[PDB]
Design a binder for this molecule. Structure first.
Ligand SMILES: CC(=O)N1C[C@H]2C[C@@H]1CN2C(=O)C[C@@]1(C(=O)Nc2cncc3ccccc23)CCOc2ccc(Cl)cc21
Ligand SMILES: [Cl-]
Lengths: 302, 298
């Protein structure tokens, strides 16, 4: 028993965190083998940010301009290339603490752990979901750019995100480890705004199933719904349309609890209609959308 | 900006998780130098009588794929101390500390000496923790990383019938009126950690959430009369002093913030949320808020 927002053990990622300094700018880098990955806006000044030509700025940079620091040790940059919005600094030393890793691009609704860093020193770890609007509700301060999001499935670290920018509404924007931003965001100080956010429906349903496994059944009802009828109601509450793929992904949870996916959708329709009514599902007074169907099967079984 | 339930980087603790097997029981152990620490219920109740039957080679310690050979064994309260032939090379700078209820810590959940998750939780006033544990998680540790020193403050032993957990400090002393045996054990009536709620209300102010603030102030005794009614911990003058830095950073006096909390208890959230929550959060200490809203690294 027990349901917590669980992050992956950060150990394998902490051994990768370096400090990347380029002039006055000092952010974080991910050191995997003989390459340090970091946001390309490390080369920008505060004024350049409006309309930077990174290609033009990087060509005026030499290897010894980038000061990489792995703890007290200083790494010697021997090369530099740019892949989309990330800078790839080739270094003289390969990371001995390099784990088994993959660069994965995640879809909105997928969750990951964020290892918050300041000056290449990890300060905290927490669990995040990729919001439908492609932003993350993170906990980031100045100097946290280059902090990575990952998932440790088996003994392999799947790097899925690198922090780049905090939008004016306090939410964050970043890229996959291949430098491709998530969402319609760019690495610029231009007027950018996160789109109208929505609730991750499949994730809420998965959390409602996790509650049933933990003995919470007060929200269940004698009703079922058509998939389309549920989406007409979900749309009104600012919920993501639940697709047939979502239904199939919820299959295992439906079998473990014995409550059909569209049966659990009817419970959710009623929860949206009536609210919690002073009650709490899994210690929460709100409907939680940051636990994927996979996170629930991982935490309630193994 | 941003406020999350943040745990300490588990790295220094992962390098200490071993698998302790004794007969049928397979739980986790904490390997610090040449000693593995684990719940004394792995031999499972006269624990002195049961331990004297077991020999060193009955305990099978496994550090990853490598097997550690046990060369000795002693018992400190509810914690088994297995002397091993090899000292842990990954041993960090550490202390065994005992925490007070209201203090928070990170839990590195393990199954078969393999860390699977890390999370934050608070020592509840009833001395239980609202953790996330399954079968095989006994021996999972709670810690705080201050500077570069890991302060081990908890080792998980069991789960109470209400889903809450009970465990000991690393010296084997249980937190609360709990014992390590299958018997009727119930968690006491829980209370809200008042200082922790106030600290979280300050963190909300820092994050631009100010709707709950009011023109009013109150006294420490008048607030406690109200807090007692709503099952809140009495806010002491020490709590007020500990909230000092937050009060200066936001410009809202501690008893001014107590007056805002007094109205949240009498009137509720009113359909509104503070830091994305519809309930008053009590698992962020005044120091957790100061560290997350200023950025202290390890
Ligand atoms: C300080 C400096 O000269 N620097 C320029 C580069 C290098 C250095 C910092 N830079 C930025 O630009 C970063 C920056 C940004 O969003 N930083 C932050 C990230 N997360 C949390 C924060 C919490 C508070 C304050 C800032 C945070 C500033 C805001 O504007 C943008 C617009 C786009 C993009 Cl891609 C990044 C940014
Ligand atoms: Cl995905």
């Amino acid at each position: 028993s027990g349901f917590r927002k669980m992050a992956f053990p950060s150990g394998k990622v902490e051994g990768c965190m370096v400090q990347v300094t380029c002039g006055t700018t000092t952010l974080n880098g991910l050191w995997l083998d003989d390459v340090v990955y970091c946001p390309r806006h490390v080369i920008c000044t505060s004024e350049d940010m409006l309309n930077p030509n990174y290609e033009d700025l990087l060509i005026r940079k030499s290897n010894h301009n980038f000061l990489v620091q792995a703890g007290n040790v200083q790494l010697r940059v021997i090369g530099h290339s740019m892949q989309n919005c990330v800078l790839k600094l080739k270094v003289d030393t390969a990371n001995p603490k390099t784990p088994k890793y993959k660069f994965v691009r995640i879809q909105p609704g997928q969750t990951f752990s964020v290892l918050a860093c300041y000056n290449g020193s990890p300060s905290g770890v927490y669990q995040c979901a990729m919001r439908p609007n492609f932003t993350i509700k993170g906990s980031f301060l100045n100097g946290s750019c280059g902090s990575v999001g990952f998932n440790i499935d088996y003994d392999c670290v799947s790097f899925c995100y690198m922090h780049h920018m905090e939008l004016p509404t306090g939410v964050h924007a970043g890229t996959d480890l291949e430098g491709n931003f998530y969402g319609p965001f760019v690495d610029r100080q231009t007027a950018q705004a996160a789109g109208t956010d929505t609730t991750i429906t499949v994730n809420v349903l998965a959390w409602l199933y996790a509650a049933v496994i933990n003995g919470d059944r007060w929200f269940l009802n004698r009703f079922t719904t058509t998939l389309n009828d549920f989406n007409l109601v979900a749309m009104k509450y600012n919920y993501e349309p639940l697709t047939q793929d979502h239904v199939d992904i919820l299959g295992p949870l439906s079998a473990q609890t014995g409550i059909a996916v569209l049966d659990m959708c009817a419970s959710l329709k009623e929860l949206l209609q009536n609210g919690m009514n002073g009650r709490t599902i899994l210690g929460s007074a709100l409907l939680e959308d940051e636990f994927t169907p996979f996170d629930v099967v991982r935490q309630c079984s193994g």
